[PDB]
Design a protein around this ligand. Sequence first.
Ligand code: CLA
Ligand SMILES: CC1=C(/C=C/C(C)=C/C=C/C(C)=C\C=C\C=C(C)\C=C\C=C(C)\C=C\C2=C(C)CCCC2(C)C)C(C)(C)CCC1
Ligand SMILES: CC1=C(C/C=C(\C)CCC[C@H](C)CCC[C@@H](C)CCCC(C)C)C(=O)c2ccccc2C1=O
Ligand code: SF4
Ligand code: SF4
Ligand code: SF4
Lengths: 62, 150, 732, 95, 80, 154, 30
Amino acid sequence: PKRGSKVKILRRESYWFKNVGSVVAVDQDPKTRYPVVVRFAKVNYANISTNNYALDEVEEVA
Amino acid sequence: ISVVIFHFSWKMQSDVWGTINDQGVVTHITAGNFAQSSITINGWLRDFLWAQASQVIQSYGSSLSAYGLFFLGAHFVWAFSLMFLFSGRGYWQELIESIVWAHNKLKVAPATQPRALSIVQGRAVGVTHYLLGGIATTWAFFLARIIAVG
Amino acid sequence: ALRIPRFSQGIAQDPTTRRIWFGIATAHDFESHDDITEGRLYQNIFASHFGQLAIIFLWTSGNLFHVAWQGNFEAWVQDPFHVRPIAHAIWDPHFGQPAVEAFTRGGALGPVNNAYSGVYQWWYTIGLRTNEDLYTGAIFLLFLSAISLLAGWLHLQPKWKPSVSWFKNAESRLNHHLSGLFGVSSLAWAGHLVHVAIPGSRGEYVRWNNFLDVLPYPQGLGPLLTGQWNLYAQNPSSSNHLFGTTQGAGTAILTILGGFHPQTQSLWLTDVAHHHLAIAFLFLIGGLMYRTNFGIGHSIKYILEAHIPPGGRLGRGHKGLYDTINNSIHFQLGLALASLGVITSLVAQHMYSLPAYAFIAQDFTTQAALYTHHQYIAGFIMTGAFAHGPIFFIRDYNPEQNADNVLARMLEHKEAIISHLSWASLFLGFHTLGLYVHNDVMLAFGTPEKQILIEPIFAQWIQSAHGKTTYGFDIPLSSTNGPALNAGRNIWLPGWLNAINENSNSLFLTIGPGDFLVHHAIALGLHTTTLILVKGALDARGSKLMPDKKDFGYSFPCDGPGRGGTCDISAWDDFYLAVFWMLNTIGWVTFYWHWKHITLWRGNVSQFNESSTYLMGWLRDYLWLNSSQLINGITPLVCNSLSVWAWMFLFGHLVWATGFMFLISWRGYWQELIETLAWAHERTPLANLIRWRDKPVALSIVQARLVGLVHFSVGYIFTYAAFLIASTSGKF
Amino acid sequence: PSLVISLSTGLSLFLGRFVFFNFQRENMAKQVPEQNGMSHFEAGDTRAKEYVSLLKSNDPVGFNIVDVLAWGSIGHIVAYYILATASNGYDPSFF
Amino acid sequence: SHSVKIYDTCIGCTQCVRACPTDVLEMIPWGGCKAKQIASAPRTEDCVGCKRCESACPTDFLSVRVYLWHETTRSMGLAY
Amino acid sequence: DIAGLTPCKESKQFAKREKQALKKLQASLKLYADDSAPALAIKATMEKTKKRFDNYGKYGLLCGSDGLPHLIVSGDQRHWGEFITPGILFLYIAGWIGWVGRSYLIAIRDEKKPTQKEIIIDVPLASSLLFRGFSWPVAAYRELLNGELVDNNF
Amino acid sequence: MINLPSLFVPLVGLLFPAVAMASLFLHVEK
Ligand code: CLA
Ligand SMILES: CC1=C(/C=C/C(C)=C/C=C/C(C)=C\C=C\C=C(C)\C=C\C=C(C)\C=C\C2=C(C)CCCC2(C)C)C(C)(C)CCC1
Ligand SMILES: CC1=C(C/C=C(\C)CCC[C@H](C)CCC[C@@H](C)CCCC(C)C)C(=O)c2ccccc2C1=O
Ligand code: SF4
Ligand code: SF4
Ligand code: SF4
């Protein structure tokens, strides 16, 4: 239902993080740990940004 | 360079500049000191500083009133080099969060994510700054020596 | 490939100069050193931390032994005050015949050092002026030297072994261990500062020997028992009584109201003989607070998990910290420099503000000597005191043995202490320092008339109520008839007023204007020689840059180009930076004092007051003037007796300086180069048959920041060091 | 002009509290023990205390503190010393 | 003798870890990411905190560093 | 009159070291005093000064030994203002820059897409974005303590 | 007989460390 919404990030892994919104896309391909494709408009020490995610996380509001 | 100048200004003077009087006798800004009181390393603080600087040390309420006003904020800004030049770099970035919380949580904060000055960039200041610092200083200084005992 | 040295394979097989750095350097690092059971290090420290107890004890059995040889006490007894307080005897086979013109000083006959260790009074006080009754403190701090290395030799033996448990036990190592440690220690002390010192201050070869057939108090040992005492405070040693002498020698013992009498100029004897004989009971309650066996007295524990109040109908819930401060040694080197932190600084004036012996308040050479020192450890203990304060974090703390209680919480809300200790400074950044600068503009531009020197209004309140009656301001107490100074108008409060203000008293010093211009500045320093610390410590738990320095540790040498956004990054190398700004923050509060104080000892107290409120004042005539006695006891004629720092100083002024290459001149410029000729001398014949045991490399970047620090500071501990002394033996 | 009390009452006040307690009931709590060897805190355990160890000996405790101080202490130094010599030398109540 | 510990996800490359100097690079096949790839070091004995190994290598939290302690004439670099 | 520090009017130092300090710039007879620039080292200036002499006076600051302004407010007598009567404004003069500072920014997510949308300032200022700066606290300073903070926003 | 204690200083500086930089020359080849 939430495809790329204002959804949170929540694991002792990240950079940005609490920082809210955005799950952009989500796959259906099972193996890994990395289903949750995030892109915001705020950045770590790369520039392309967007690195991937999932599992013990999205502990969020609307 | 910020040596060599030096050697010069204690030759021209002390042992070249003069004045006149008369009985065969030229009389220099300072003594034929030098010869044997600029051998020893020291001789240049005994007699190249606190023997000079007097010029600038006192030198307020006057017109030496800039060279009593430069190497001040020229010593700091010889100084405010090492802070960027002895310092770390990750240490500083690591920092500019912390504060960040203040703006952000209280929503102000940039988006030109205020990162902390790039390594080279701060081997691009304690270079300029050091290297602005101990110059003026010595031009805040060497100056005001010359003119009244000049 | 290279088996030696030891502790671990790692660096002991390693084949470059490192080993020797990375032997010697990391050589008391054992608590992460592959060779250590749960004892081994706990085991270690013990002998270890006797061990030095040894030399501290051979620190002085000598230098005691040293004097009476050397110097001239048994002499100096005839007349007690000039002087050139006398250190050691200097066998320096380079010194030009002018060894006469050198240091044929005090009692000499040889180019002796000018002693400044104070002590020479701390010994005059306890008792002796007879060095034939020295020879012994020597032999005693030997009676402790050999003796205690059996605590060495021996209790470093599984048999009369230690445990580990025995070490973690809290309520014994502590509770019991106030009572002994301090407690009793005084008594006899508290009493020696009573029963062997009095009788010379009365004047009497009391010695040991005649050790009962004295009875310095007439009424034996009665009223002590009984319930009646004031036949003791009875007639204080009195008013003129040339000190430790004849006349006015008003027998009494345990006194506690008078204080100084101009002559000693120094807290009068056996009126701190009641002091040491009171503190006691203030642990000898809170000193049988807990335990040994017996089922009565304290646990601690619900001290917390109940007593987390002050806190909790919300808040923090302690459910025990403990298994942390008792499991995590650090804490035992978290707070045993941490708090023997403070003491250093609250000894850094008590010790002066009112002395304690054979004349120092008017020596102006201890103060000079025996101060800054006792300050620089309030540095070098107070600092590197939070270091073992990151540690437990990345190297004792488990976020889960604790994440109920304050610390982990402290943490959860940590990026805050950081940023209010910060706003604590950017401000103590512009101000105390913005103002401060037309206080340096005007004063230059003929305009001192107009000027921003805002005179302290606050400290101000104190120092009067606490007695001091010096001009203006019609309030109570020090009224010299006032109702905090009443109800108690005799107890404690004539004497500590009788000397309160004319300066050969220095007591509560004469507050000037801009007095806070440093005072403020010194409540800048700190707030900005923390945060370093309380990062280099705090978030240096992990960060988010590299959210795992947790693994990494405390002492990782920088980082490399890693995504242009990383570098010098040890929580260690935040202690590095921390030890910069602190020596800055001492940088300052030793100017003040020297400026100030110096002022007085030659009457001229426009050596501040007039000046400092605009810094060339500092530079001109704190810094520029006074000198070239020192730096003209060198001066193309000779050397006389202030010769040294004229050397040492330029030393500090070199040995500083070159803590610079290492520093500005980083790492991969050294190898590269030290190759291009580590190489040249590998080709050139005759000195060809020379292949060298290991193989010359440049220096771990840490190091290349360390020996930046111990050439530096060493330089920097130097000079001011030699100056603060130089200075005063010319001018006072 | 000072009654050295308050204090010197309380320097005794709880001295007298652990000569105290416990003649018979075996050997004076628990049991005994703890001593050397080590049985207690961070060998393992390290928990979890109550405290009703007060309530017993209190009603008792008051008597002895706040009068023997007037029969011992501020109660002569007593005759007696007898025995005798007389007696220690027999004493003035010191005074 | 290479350290400390360094972590998952990337590879392929074509835009990440393609540039250790002293090798220290396979690529197993392994199943998880969007085609198959898990890695640090089929090695680590030729390297050398050549730490250019994440500069080229994203994926979130510390990602490359050094810790050589022993520190070795294999990768302390100094040949001659 | 408090702590010292006398109100200036007994003149002892200040007033004199003054009529000394300034007044050997005045011995600038050492030039030629009529009309100048090139010189007026003498005649004028002292107008701001000496013809403001007994003028400065005049409210005391209880200028003190040395004979100079030991400038103090702390909340006693008339002074409760030698820096506070000019002590509040600063507070005032700053953090409503904070309002512009805020609402300038708190616009830099509105009209949408931001940053250098910070470098090109959209001449950000002149009225309510500033000209609210005028009126913030005790009428609306608790723009703080409700819906804007919390924070509460999105 | 008499004159000295120099005995010590040509040690403590001259041979002693001459023997420090001698036997831990080392530590290595201790
Ligand atoms: C984060 C802090 C930590 C803390 C808690 C302290 C605390 C202290 N340091 Mg310190 N220090 C630290 C880190 C710390 N330090 C670090 C990292 C360094 C390395 C640079 C130092 C270096 C250092 C030096 C060199 C010295 C100190 C000194 C002191 C003491 C000075 C007394 C004072 O505060 O005057 C003012 C304090 C007041 C409380 C008066 C102002 C009252 C205000 C706050 C009123 C508002 C509240 C309320 C009405 C008052 C209740 C509080 C009450 C106590 C009055 C104080 C105990 C000095 C010292 O040791 O004593 C001789 C000094 O020697 N420190
Ligand atoms: C806070 C504030 C402020 C402050 C400021 C200050 C206080 C400053 C100072 C600072 C310091 C403390 C120092 C500095 C100084 C400066 C300088 C130093 C400059 C320079 C320069 C130049 C440009 C030059 C050049 C040259 C040449 C040509 C060569 C030879 C030499 C010389 C130098 C001449 C301001 C106003 C901004 C604003 C508002 C607020
Ligand atoms: C302080 C410091 C920084 C942080 C310094 C920064 C980010 C420079 C600040 C840039 C300017 C001053 C921005 C501040 C605001 C100004 C643009 C103007 C506002 C102030 C008034 C004039 C109005 C580093 O990045 C660094 C890197 C490597 C070694 C040492 C250091 C180092 O010491
Ligand atoms: S210390 Fe050297 S290796 Fe580390 S980031 Fe800085 S420049 Fe690179
Ligand atoms: S290190 Fe580089 S190649 Fe390896 S998984 Fe990470 S990003 Fe991919
Ligand atoms: S340290 Fe880094 S660059 Fe060097 S081989 Fe290893 S992963 Fe590659």
